[PDB]
Structure formats: structure tokens, C-alpha cells
């Protein structure tokens, strides 16, 4: 028999200067446990790589260095735009294989936002705590850890898909025929979850035929809401800025508004503060300001460094990712997202969101 | 050979108290010409019917009374909600057959917004000038008249489709089998226009299999814009209020924003003023206010009674209707809409929109 929740437990980074308290696992302890119990390999994937920025990050980097010295195959995937600290990394860990990934060389827009660890096809972590010192010590982060071998292997498959886009030599990022020969596989999705847990993936041109797009899954879970929608992301402006041009993408925006006005769903949005000079952010703010007073909608803003990307639907579905709900991310960036329906795990996630909502760092929206 | 523009000419109602001037045909003269040249029948369809409110409307009603007395079959279709003045109408014209229409008895939401005349399968008018004294004398209106027999017959087919929904006795508004036996036909659509002119129809459950939905046509013409979008409607709030519940429908709203931000289309919106107590209208206003200053978008408001529903795309497509661009109308109401691509007719429509844009009644948007 399979376990309920797939042996998944919540992990988060709560700095000392912040009032966030919980009995759950910390990202520091999580990475320590992943490295200690490692016997075959440790695969890590994120955007940037700079663990030495804080103390705990340096400690994790030292433990990983010891693991690589003992014979463990360490492979670290980071986007080619986080290539600044690369010369700093290889100088400290010559046995760790660092690989620059460019998942989109057609237009140079897609970015690698894996932000997950997998070890021995037995242990795994997935969240918004990248392999940096801030995401481990000073930046509040959220994610999930599991010692369930099948889930860890299904995440290792995503790591395999992402590794093939290395820049050096012909690979899936250079040749079309070699990229077409990528066994893009998945063992569990929304049509066949394991222990009430599955992985969604992004972007669309990297799914193959089996994997499920995170965009469609999130939009469906938002359109199928009946009771409550609780979102803690950075910002939900329907317009991003790619290069020097504004890009309009209101899919999640309009789905949430459809939930709020037509279906009257109690929605609470905890987002990061915005620049007063950005007219798009101010337009979004004053648009939601007239909707909070008309329908059952609440909005709070935070100013702290928080990478948390949490979605909770009807106290029955939970969705934790490393990408933010916007156009650029769900249209070009490549990432993996944890989705669960286990009532216990969703209840713990609801507890975390309730703690964050009434936190002192969550001031009410004022315009 | 077929004529260019399908013998169509612009018709409009410009009151004396307003500064609108044009050499085009007036709605009063248009109805006079339709009634005078009538030899077989005169079919009229609108929402409400109250011509005696003004002088010119009473004159048109008297001419129609004379036509009915001479033996012309006069049938007037009005929605069952405009049934107040019914006893006033039949008392003055006993020979005119007035019919109450309820196109939606399932939920009692759909309303008859035909707003067109057809005579002898030879002459026809279609616009936003209903069969009322205001739409002929005191309310600025817009529409098109044509003495082209095929176009008039294709509009008479729409009149036939709408007539079958009479309330008294079993008909297309009472029985399902009798409604299924409605020869819902059309001779021209966007895939086979005549002289660069075609009719779009609404709602979706009244199209059959041949007619084209006005919603899809308008959304496609807005998404396929490259140069300019000029809209003169009442309001473009993505939220209406049906009964005592708000209904969110941002399809046209989001298509226009997609045209403005992503494609940078120069868009000028001439809409009617809104209530300061309506939070949805204020939200829409302050949303567009931050977009006019960022992209090439301009907004002006008018306070006069104007039923004009004009859309102009790239100085190549023109769309004149009686319904307003919103959710309730294009989701439940039943109407017919004129669409043309003839460069001469679209140029005249652009002239009319330019005259209205710089008019004194068009004050710049201020918040
Ligand atoms: C491009 C953009 C578009 C919007 C937008 O679409 N605002 N519109 C409403 O918020 C609304 C108004 C009335 N009814 C329902 C919703 C907001 C911000 C931004 Cl940057």
C-alpha cells in the first residue's frame, strides 16, 4: 500500500529577524538530511547559485563539498545568467560538476527555475528555496521534503529533462534532432497522482506528450474553486516587462476575478509591495481596491524578502512552486511545481498561510 | 456584377441641440423613404416601441399608420418588457400587428434588440435607432440604409427567426420541438460576404449551424488589429449587473488591452459617463487611466443620450450594432449587427468617428 501524502512534510526558511515560528522542518536541516543520507548522488537545480552569502549557506556548501570528496556524484544545474559566481563555486568544490543551462536559446527568454534537490532516488526537496545563502538563512522560503523513492524518482526525471540543455557542445539546447531524442517521461500527473501528490511542469515546449502544464493545472484549480482561494505569491500583476517591452498576460488574474465576482469565492491575496513609479502595479492595485470593497476579497502586502509561492484552494488543494503567477514565468520559464490534495498536508499549508496572513509583516492594503 | 458596399449608406440621428453636422441621411428621412417606397410589407424590430414621445417619431408613426391603412402588412416586434406602451400603440394603429417577443423564457434574461427595418425584400435599415421618438428626434443614433434586395432579404431572414418567439400560443418560445423546426437561415456571413457586407447575429443559442456569432467576429477583428481601434459605445466595463448580481465578462475588455499593450495599437474609446457610486465603473476608469499614460490609448466621455455602437478597425473594418460591448448583451440578448469592409463605407465611418471624437460633447477623461 502507498502512504497518505506520499511521506511529504512541509519545509520552510524563517529568519531570526522575522516573527515566523513553526514546528516544521527548516530548509537548513532539510539540506543537511539530504546530504547526510546521500549514498549515490545529489542533484540540485535552481536559477542562481551563491551559497556563501550567509553562514548556513556556507555550512551547507561545506557539507556538499565533503559529500563530493567522499565519492558522491554532485551535479548542480544553474541558468547561464547566474554564471557570475561560477568561478567562485568551482574554486571551492573542484569535485562538484556545475552545469550552465539555457532551456531557451531560440529567443533567450526561458530561465531555469528548478529549485529542487533529489538524492539516491529516495529523498527529495522541492520549493522556492534556491541553492543560495539567502534562501537558506535570511530569506523566508517554503517547500516540501519527502523520503518517498517513487516521488524522488519522478523528480529526478525532471532533473534529467533539464540537464540536457547544457550550453557546451551539441545537446538539447543546440540541436533539434538531439532535443527530439529526449525521453521526457513522468510517472505521476493530475490524472494519476501518487498518495495525493503530483508534479506539474513548465514550459509548454518542454512537456512532451505526457507531462502536464502547470499553467493549465493552476487555471483549472482556480476556476473550479467553490469556497476559498488563498494565494501568497510575489505579485499578481497581469503585465510583466520582458527586456524593454511590456507583456500582457491576464489568465490567472482573470480566473481569480471570475472566482471572486461570479462565484463569490472568499479570496485572500498576500503579495509583495510594489513600486509607486510602476503604473501597471498601481493600476492593478487600484483595480483590486474597488473589488475588495464590493466582493469578499482581501489583500495584504509584505516588504520582506520572501520567495514563497503558495496556492490553497478550498482547503482541499495545495500548490507550491518556485515561479510567480505571471505571464513571463508560466509562458517561458522552466520549473517544476508540487501539487497535493492530502487533507493533512493541505491543512498544514492552510495553517502556514493563516500564520502569514495575520503576521506583523502583512500590513493591510492601502491606496 | 454586385455593387461595391452593397448600396449601403450611412444614416444617423443628430439632434438640433447638438453640434453634430453631416451630409449623410437622417433616420427620419430613412424611415420616410422606407415607408413611402413600401409595396408589400414593413417589418420593424426593436426593444421598446414608443414613437409618440417626440414630433418626428409621431410623424413616422402616422406615415406607418397610413401605410397599414392602404393594405401594407405591418408587423412590429418588441420585447415583452416594452409592453407598457402596447395598449397605447394598438389604440392608434388597429391595422398594425404588434407582437411581444421573449427570446429567452428559460431564464428570462435574453432581450430582443433587433433595431432594424426591412421592406419588400428590397429596402432595409439596421442600426441603433429603435422605433421610438427619441431615437428619431432627440437621441443621437447611427446605422446604415440599403436598397439592395439580397441584403434586405438576408435581414428579413433574421426578422423571421426573431418573430417565432411570440409569447401567445405554442411557438419557438414555448415548445422545444417547434423551436427546433425553425429554418434559421443566412445568405451571407464572414466567410461569404456580399459587396463587402455581412450580418452577424446574437445570441449563440439562436444561430443554428450557419449564422456567425457577433461575439466571435468582434473578438477576432479586435485581436487581428494592427494599426488602430476606434470604439464609440456606451461603456466597456467588463462587469454588468444582471438582476441583483454582478456578472464578470472581460472578453472584449481583455482583447482590447491585448491590442493596446502587446501590439501597441492606437486605441481611442469614446464612452458614456459613469456613476461615481458604481465601484466597477470607477475601477475600470482608474485601470484605463494608468494605461492611457503608458501606452498609446485615449479615452473621452460623453453625457448626451447617444445609442451609437460603432467599431472601426485599421480603417478597413467597420461594425455597427444596437447592443453594447459587455457581458449581458453578447451572452443573452438577441440582435443583428452590420459589418463591412468596403473602403469607402469604412472611410465615411472613420469620418463620423473623427467628428465625434473632437466634438464638444467629448470631454477628455479625468479622474
Ligand atoms: C493591464 C492591466 C489591466 C488591468 C485590468 O484588467 N483591470 N480591470 C479590473 O480590475 C476590473 C474592472 C471591472 N470589473 C472587473 C475587473 C489591471 C491592471 C493592469 Cl496593469
Swiss-Prot record, chains A, B:
Cell compartments where the protein resides: Virion membrane; Host Golgi apparatus, Host trans-Golgi network; Host endoplasmic reticulum membrane
Major enzyme class: hydrolase
Stored InterPro entries: Diverse_PLD-related, PLDc_3, PLipase_D/transphosphatidylase
Catalytic activity of the protein: a 1,2-diacyl-sn-glycero-3-phosphocholine + H2O = a 1,2-diacyl-sn-glycero-3-phosphate + choline + H(+)
Any Gene Ontology biological process: viral budding via host ESCRT complex
Keyword Hydrolase: yes
Matching Gene3D superfamilies: Endonuclease Chain A (3.30.870.10)
SUPFAM superfamilies membership: Phospholipase D/nuclease
Superkingdom, taxonomy of origin: Viruses
Post-translational modification: Palmitoylated. Attachment of the palmitate moiety is essential for correct intracellular targeting and protein function.
Pfam families: PLDc_3
GO cellular component: host cell endoplasmic reticulum membrane; host cell Golgi apparatus; membrane; viral envelope; viral membrane; virion membrane
Keyword annotations from UniProtKB, A to Z: Host endoplasmic reticulum, Host Golgi apparatus, Host membrane, Host-virus interaction, Hydrolase, Late protein, Lipoprotein, Membrane, Palmitate, Viral budding, Viral budding via the host ESCRT complexes, Viral envelope protein, Viral release from host cell, Virion
Motif YPPL mapped to chain: 148-151
Known role: Major envelope protein that plays a role in the biogenesis of the viral double membrane and in egress of virus from the host cell. Produces the wrapped form of virus that is required for cell-to-cell spread. Acts as a lipase with broad specificity including phospholipase C, phospholipase A, and triacylglycerol lipase activities.
Subunit structure: Interacts with protein OPG190/B5.
Listed name of the protein: Envelope phospholipase OPG057
Organism, scientific name: Vaccinia virus (strain Western Reserve) (VACV)
Gene: OPG057
